[PDB]
């Protein structure tokens, strides 16, 4: 039942703001503390903010110290982040994540209640903040022709803004020895990744095969036959 | 500040093996702050210990943590095949609180060579002023793996991007692809393009290449 939902997330160009929600329930919001965690394309997780029970401690990552703001508001169960100046480097997701419910002073003594933000066992789904200056891109679909046991053939999806994209095979049919890569951003701000699958080495001259790319974002949906 | 090194980068476990990841931190720290995490992929992490030494909420019986000063250890009786993921240390005896850069948990299989395939830059990229000429490795084991391009005797360097996808389900193999992007200028301007890959499942370095337009 207990459940935290993140929100405000979405493409900023940089420099400009940006204000994260996080909408706790289930639990009693006023004893626990609460941080903010998030995690960049396909790295570890980074700390970003945090603060106790009432609010009144409140510490920030190194990298965001100054730029952003976290605050609560006990009386409706919401967290929030204030986000600003953002550079590029802010891509991530970001988790709201719940603190705990105590806390200990230096002395040893365990005082209830009062809880901050040492360690966080409820994490939201987290809300994905992408920070870049370039425009909504469709993709351009390029041929990945076998050429000499088996034969590889895939689709070069390049050049595209933002994620996500989805390959398919022939439709729903062909699934198996498909590998489609992760995406990777690129010098010019736009992502591109690759789609390959193996079939028999014979296979070619008698069967077709088509890649199904679709990017919602941008209502491109391409198809695409590989040929030698 | 505390700077937390998981060793080693990826474990590689087999089910019912037993598995002990390693936290080392830069300062002592007490052993009642500090905390893990579990990340399957996907998902949002999940606590796991906290406190040094105590499971979290619905945590198995296998799972235990432990340590002092500047070594912490995570450790699992017997992995099941639910426990693949990645798993991050944290600490909190110092300001900022900090994660490790994690440790990933693999199904650990036999040895198994790349098949390395190479692609040129199609003709529709061509008339677009670009150039992308791809290598392909496919279902190699271990993930470990040195891709190095080569035009016409000339190492390559900066201008080539790698992706590599997540452990295969059904073989539990990887497969990774290198990316070398040119201007169409440049890509004129030479007739071999070779990519050498090294791996533990080759005996020698194996070089795929085309000579452009044969």
């Known amino acids: 039942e207990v459940q935290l939902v993140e929100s405000g997330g979405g493409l900023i160009r940089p420099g400009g703001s940006l204000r994260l929600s996080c909408k706790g329930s289930?639990?009693?919001?006023?004893?626990?503390?609460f941080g903010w965690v998030r995690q960049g394309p396909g790295k570890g997780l980074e700390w970003v903010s945090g603060?106790?029970?009432?609010?009144?401690?409140?510490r920030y990552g190194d990298s965001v110290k100054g730029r952003f703001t976290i605050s609560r508001d006990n009386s409706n169960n919401f967290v929030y982040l204030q986000m600003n100046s953002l550079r590029p480097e802010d891509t991530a997701i970001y988790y709201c994540?719940?603190?705990?419910?105590?806390?200990?002073?230096?002395?040893?003594?365990?005082?209830?209640?009062?809880?901050?933000?040492?360690?966080?066992?409820?994490w939201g789904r987290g809300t994905l903040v992408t920070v870049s200056s370039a425009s909504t891109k469709g993709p351009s679909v390029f041929p990945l022709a076998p050429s000499s046991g088996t034969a590889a053939l895939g689709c070069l999806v390049k050049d595209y803004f933002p994620e996500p994209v989805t390959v398919s095979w022939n439709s729903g049919a062909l699934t198996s020895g498909v590998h489609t890569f992760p995406a990777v951003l690129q010098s010019s701000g736009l992502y591109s990744l690759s789609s390959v699958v193996t079939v028999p080495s014979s296979s070619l001259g008698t069967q077709t095969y088509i890649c199904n790319v679709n990017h919602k974002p941008s209502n491109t949906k391409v198809d695409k036959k590989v040929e030698p | 500040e505390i700077v937390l090194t998981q060793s080693p980068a990826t474990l590689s476990v087999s089910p019912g093996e037993r598995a002990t990841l390693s936290c080392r931190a830069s300062?002592?720290?007490?052993?009642?702050?500090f905390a893990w995490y579990q990340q399957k992929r996907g998902q949002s992490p999940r606590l796991l210990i906290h406190?040094?030494?105590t499971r979290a909420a619905g945590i198995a019986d296998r799972f235990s943590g432990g340590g002092s000063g500047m070594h912490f250890t995570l450790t699992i009786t017997r992995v099941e095949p639910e426990d693949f993921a990645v798993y991050f240390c944290?600490?909190?005896?110092?300001?900022?609180?900090?994660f490790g850069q994690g440790t990933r948990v693999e199904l650990r299989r036999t040895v198994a060579a790349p098949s390395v395939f190479i692609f040129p830059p199609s003709d529709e990229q061509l008339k677009s002023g670009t150039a992308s000429v791809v290598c392909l490795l496919n279902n190699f084991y271990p993930r470990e793996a040195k891709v190095q391009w080569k035009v016409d005797n000339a190492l390559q360097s900066g201008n080539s991007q790698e992706s590599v996808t997540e452990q295969d389900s059904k073989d539990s193999t990887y497969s990774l692809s290198s990316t070398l992007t040119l201007s169409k200028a440049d890509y004129e301007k030479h007739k071999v393009y070779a990519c050498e890959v090294t791996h533990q499942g080759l005996s020698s370095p194996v070089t795929k290449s085309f000579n452009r337009g044969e």
């Open positions: 944290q600490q909190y005896g110092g300001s900022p609180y900090t």
């Open positions: 289930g639990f009693i919001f006023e004893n626990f503390g």
């Open positions: 406190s040094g030494s």
């Open positions: 300062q002592n720290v007490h052993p009642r702050y």
């Open positions: 994540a719940r603190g705990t419910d105590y806390t200990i002073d230096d002395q040893g003594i365990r005082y209830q209640g009062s809880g901050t933000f040492w360690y966080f066992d409820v």
């Open positions: 603060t106790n029970w009432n609010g009144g401690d409140s």
